[PDB]
């Protein structure tokens, strides 16, 4: 007959469980995929473009037009999330330092946490102590970092690993082929000697033999994070229920409902005041589409890499529009208000 549904339960919140979503759980959560970079239709009615930002299946911002996904009023509608697919993986500003630390905490080939088995067991025992606090967890991570950065080879692999550092703009560099004043490693000789064809087609490559090290792109670090063993996940201080380390690398973007993004149609003029976040979402869609176009048309590899970096910068600005390490020459636009700006400040 009729499916019984309990309207309400007399419950009260006990605690909030913070945690990351996978870009895959992210895609599961979202209702529609945002593909239209442009906002409204060409007709004078200014109809919002379907499957794009400011669609009215995605929450609602105007009193007259209700939510299309949920049949509720502007006030009643809670809002629906959308998802945007990124053709290339992108770093996360909140998790940039985190990925740097993990890459310093695990190797690049064996990928396990890089400490002695006795050190691992001792840290596990100290972590088994009930009720570990936030400050204690930060101290634990710092202790593990200090004891891990003083070695070079993981127990599993034994591959040599140098220091990993941020170079410039959302860029991670690992000097695997360390230059030494002593005898050089055989692996270093193999790596340097194998530039035969590049030197053949470019003499200037040979002077660039040094200062040319392993840079960890978002895609390769995503692949590494996929293959992480579960055993080392607790040693990474990462609660498995909250999220797997692969979730830190962002390859999908949840666009939030129209409840957060206002569209103030200024009746005094022929325009609508719009949030900088919606503009940055439009720019992100444009960047993804133009990356697709350049991949189809076969542009320079360097041009594709610049497109990837500019996408990373766009996502960074969308997350936080106040960064001190952007592309000086590649001037974006002007000052904007990001999510952090909406959060912090008086």
């Amino acid at each position: 007959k009729e499916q019984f549904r309990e309207t309400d339960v007399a419950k009260k919140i006990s605690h909030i469980c913070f945690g990351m979503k996978s870009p895959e759980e992210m895609r599961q959560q979202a209702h529609i995929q945002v593909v239209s970079k442009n906002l409204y239709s060409q007709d004078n009615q200014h109809a919002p473009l379907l499957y794009g930002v400011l669609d009215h299946r995605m929450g609602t911002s105007e009193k007259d037009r209700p939510c299309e996904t949920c049949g509720k009023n502007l006030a009643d509608c809670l809002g629906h999330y959308g998802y945007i697919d990124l053709e290339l993986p992108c770093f996360h500003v909140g998790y940039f330092r985190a990925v740097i630390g993990i890459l310093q905490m695990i190797c690049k080939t064996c990928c396990h946490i890089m400490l002695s088995q006795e050190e691992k067991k001792q840290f596990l025992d100290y972590l088994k102590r009930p009720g570990l606090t936030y400050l204690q967890k930060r101290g634990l991570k710092k202790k593990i970092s200090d004891k891990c950065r003083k070695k070079n080879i993981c127990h599993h692999c034994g591959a040599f690993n140098g220091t990993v550092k941020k170079c410039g703009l959302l860029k991670i560099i690992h000097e695997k082929y360390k230059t030494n004043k002593k005898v050089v490693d055989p692996i270093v000789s193999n790596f340097l000697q194998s530039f035969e064809t590049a030197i053949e087609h470019n003499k200037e490559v040979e002077p660039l033999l040094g200062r040319a090290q392993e840079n960890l792109n978002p895609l390769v670090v995503l692949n590494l994070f996929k293959r992480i063993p579960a055993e080392d996940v607790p040693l990474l201080l990462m609660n498995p229920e909250a999220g797997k380390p692969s979730d830190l690398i962002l390859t999908r973007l949840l666009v939030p409902p129209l409840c957060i993004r206002p569209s103030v149609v200024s009746d005094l003029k022929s325009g609508t005041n719009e949030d900088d976040l919606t503009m940055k979402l439009t720019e992100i869609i444009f960047l993804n589409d133009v990356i697709k176009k350049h991949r189809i048309s076969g542009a320079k590899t360097q041009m594709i890499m610049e497109d990837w970096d500019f996408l990373q910068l766009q996502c960074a600005l969308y997350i936080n529009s106040e960064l001190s390490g952007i592309p000086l020459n590649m001037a974006p636009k002007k000052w904007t208000r990001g999510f952090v700006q909406r959060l912090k400040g008086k």
């Binding site: 605690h15 985190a98 606090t133 936030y134 609660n239 936080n320 952090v340 959060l343 912090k344």
Partner: protein, 89 residues
């Protein structure tokens, strides 16, 4: 007594509040919201809602004051009433 209940003299400064208290929301709201929130999420921290600050934030009645005790309506009731017996079993 509050300032020394942990065995060490703890200030009323932001460092002190970070020390004796733990709530993620309060630490984020005090200063540097992005770093604190993202670090807390990275550590996968779970945060209770027993404190008054989050109770106001969460919109739930606080435990201090009138929100401490629970009320019970003295109605005419018979707990565990007589049971109609099944014959088939």
């Amino acid at each position: 007594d509050l300032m020394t209940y942990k065995g060490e003299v703890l200030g009323i400064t932001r460092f002190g509040l970070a020390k004796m208290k733990e709530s993620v929301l309060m630490l984020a709201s005090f200063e540097k919201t992005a770093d604190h929130l993202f670090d807390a999420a990275y550590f996968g921290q779970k945060d209770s809602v027993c404190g008054v600050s989050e109770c106001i934030i969460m919109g739930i009645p606080m435990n201090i004051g009138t929100g401490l005790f629970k009320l019970l309506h003295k109605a005419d009731r018979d707990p565990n009433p007589p049971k109609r017996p099944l014959i088939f079993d």
